[PDB]
Structures are given as structure tokens and as C-alpha cells.
Amino acid sequence: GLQQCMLVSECSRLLTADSVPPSDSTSILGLDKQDLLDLLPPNMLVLWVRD
Amino acid sequence: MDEKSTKIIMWLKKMFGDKPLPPYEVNTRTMEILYQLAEWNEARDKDLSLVTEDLKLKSAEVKAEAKYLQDLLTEGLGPSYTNLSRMGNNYLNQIVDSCLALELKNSSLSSYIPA
């Protein structure tokens, strides 16, 4: 759970070049932050891991 | 002698700013000493300027990385990683303060031990 949370976070950041919304910037592999958040373990497991 | 003298007078004017240059005995020895001092000061001022500008740049870079790591940890571990117990915070501060005291690149044992 912890490894997966860290990995998702690391990869989310790879995608979010904090750059300026350009409404037009082509993401790597066409992936958005939301596509990665879906690969997170179930919310009950994430809270358990953080506690 | 005339060139060294000019350099000294210019240097003294720079150092004393708007204050009238104090009268001093101008002999071969006093001029040599002042000249060595002027050369030394000029060379050090240059070095210190370069170091000061670099530290400003490094301060910006460290700040940027700190923000990055904070964001990474918040997104990955949640806000709860910042809610450590009093003792936990004390332990964290001691590691941090020890590393700063030894001017380490990071908190790894590979850095702490040799230091």
C-alpha cells in the first residue's frame, strides 16, 4: 500500500509539470492525474496505511 | 610608481567614500604596504561577490526542492506525516540540526559517518 501510494504520487508529479494550465499541454502517454489516482488502493486501505 | 600610486589613491577613495582621505606619510614602504593591501582587498572582494551570488542561487534552488518534496510527501503520505508526536518531532529536529552542524549533503549514514 505504502509503495503504491508513493509511486502514484511520484508519477503524478512527473505528469503535472506544475507548468501553467496551458489548457493545451500534451501529457505523457496522454495520461492525466486522474488516470493515476485510479490505480491507488481502495480509500480504506490508503487511510489505514497513512495511520 | 606613478601607476601604483594612482591605484592606491583610487582604492582609498573607494574605501573611505565621502570622507576626506586622511593625510599620511607617502614613502616607498607605506606605498608598498598599501599597494599589497589594495591588491588583496580587490581580489577578496571579487571572490566574496561570486560566493554571495552563488549562495543566493543555491537558496532559491533549495527552496524549490523543499517545496517539491513537501508536495510529494503530502500527496503520497497525507498531511498526517506532519502530525508527529512531541518526541517524534524532537528526534526529527535533532537529526536535522546534527546534519546542519556537520554541513552534510543529506541525512544518510554514508554522509554522517565520514563527517
Place this chain on the structure above:
Amino acid sequence: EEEVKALQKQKNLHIRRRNKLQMVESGNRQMCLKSKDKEEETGRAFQEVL
């Protein structure tokens, strides 16, 4: 005499620190071998995704 005592203390200290370092080094060596195994496992998982 104080110097001899001080140097003996220092010698003992260096011996203890050397021993500790040797432990840390052995531990790290073992960890580095196992990390290579992880690299191989993760390499297989990556081939599955491909």
C-alpha cells in the same frame, strides 16, 4: 600520562567506530545484493506490462 590516557581513549574509540562501520558495511553489502534481486523482479514485472 594524560596524553597517553587520552590517546588510549581515542584508540578505543576508533576501534569501536571501525567495528561499527564494518557492521554497517556488511549490512549495506547484503542490502545491495538483495536490491539487485529487486531490480530483477521489477524488471520481470515491467516485461509483463510490455
Place this chain on the structure above:
Amino acid sequence: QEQIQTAEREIVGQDLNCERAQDLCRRSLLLRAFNKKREEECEALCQSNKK
């Protein structure tokens, strides 16, 4: 001191940076997320073929 310095050089050399394994994990996760998106796109073309 010479022994300690040799041992130090060895520890510094062993600084296990599992960066390669971590890179592979990141790539794997990103590609998994990519695969999921491409599966959704395949399902959409399948629907068009049925029509």
C-alpha cells in the same frame, strides 16, 4: 584511521541508490495506466464496428 577511511570509501561506494529499480517501477505504473486508457479506446472502436 587508514582502516576507517578505507571502510568509509566502501560505504560511500555502496550507497545503494535503487534508482534503476525505482525507474522501472515508475515506468511500469505509467504503462499500466496507459494500458488502461488504451483498453477504453479499443472498447470504443469495438462499439463502432458493431454498428
Place this chain on the structure above:
Amino acid sequence: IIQESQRLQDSIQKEVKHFSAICLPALLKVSTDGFNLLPSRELSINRMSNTHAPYYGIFKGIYESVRLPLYKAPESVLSHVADMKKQLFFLRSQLSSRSEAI
């Protein structure tokens, strides 16, 4: 349709091949001045952070040449070199004084 379908032929494989060649850390861009995004690996503070960083081998060599320990923070390199220059000046002055005294 034939033309557009041909464009999308092996589209997944083509993309994966280009992805496999990219360096992921090059994607991590940080803004130091709020305006210019630079890859974190290109930051001067990270030149010694990882053995795999592009400039690690070069700076390792520079640290060893100026006798600066590898555990020291990268921000210390210029200050240290400045001190070394200061020392050189002092040694020259000492030599000159001693040569005069002899």
C-alpha cells in the same frame, strides 16, 4: 477510413518505444524564479545527489581536486575554493616574509 486506420496502426507500440527512450527524471521540472521550469536534475544542488546523475562523475573529480569531502553540501564548494585562495595568498606572504628575514 483506410488512411486514418493506417495512421493508428501499431499506435501503442510506437508510443511505448518512444517512452522507453525518455528519462523520467527530466520530466521533473521545478521553478526557481516562478517563471523558468528547469529539470530538477539540472539544478546545481543535485549534481552530487545521485551516482547516476549526468554530471556526478565530473563534479566528483572537482571535489577530489580541491580536497572537499563528498559528504559536504554542494553549496560549500565555492566558499571552500575561496578559502583555499585566501590560504594561497597567506602562504605567499609568509614565504616572502621569511625570504626577506633570511
Place this chain on the structure above:
Amino acid sequence: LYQLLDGDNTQKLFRTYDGLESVAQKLSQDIASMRDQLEVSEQEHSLLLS
């Protein structure tokens, strides 16, 4: 760093990393050479005193 080591604002049009390592090695050598000269000078002085 290059400016700090070379002193000479000689606007070298192309600064290389290999050049930077060389100038850094030179500073270290200069300091070592100066320390050796001082040591010699100290021996000379000691001989004269003897």
C-alpha cells in the same frame, strides 16, 4: 567556479568541464608547492641558525 579559479576574466569563449577540473587541480598543486617552498625555506633558516 571557473571565474573563482582562473581569476583572469579572459573571456574564454568556450568553458569546458575538463578545463574546470584542471584549473581546480592547479590551485591544489599551487598550495602544495607553496607549502613545500615554505618548508625548504624553514630548513634553510634552521641551517643558518645551526
Place this chain on the structure above:
Amino acid sequence: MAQTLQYVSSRLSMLQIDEEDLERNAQFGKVLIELCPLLGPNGGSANLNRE
């Protein structure tokens, strides 16, 4: 005069100044004392050292 020398030598460790230099040149000694605060312990300008 001995005090002036000690002060100048401590702050301007690079200067090889002898007592004969300050005895023959009293006004020069005053100049050096005035320069000492303007020059930091390392030979650099006091302002730049503060910065």
C-alpha cells in the same frame, strides 16, 4: 604604538608591519586603524562580508 600594531596584525594578518614602520610613519598608522573596520577579518570589504 605596540597596541596599534597588535590590532592591525590581528585584523590584517597578511600585512607584514613592523614597529619601525609605525614609529617612522605615525599618520600612516592612523590610516591603517581607520581602514581595519572597513576591511573585514579576511581582507574583504565589511559591507560585502555583511551581505
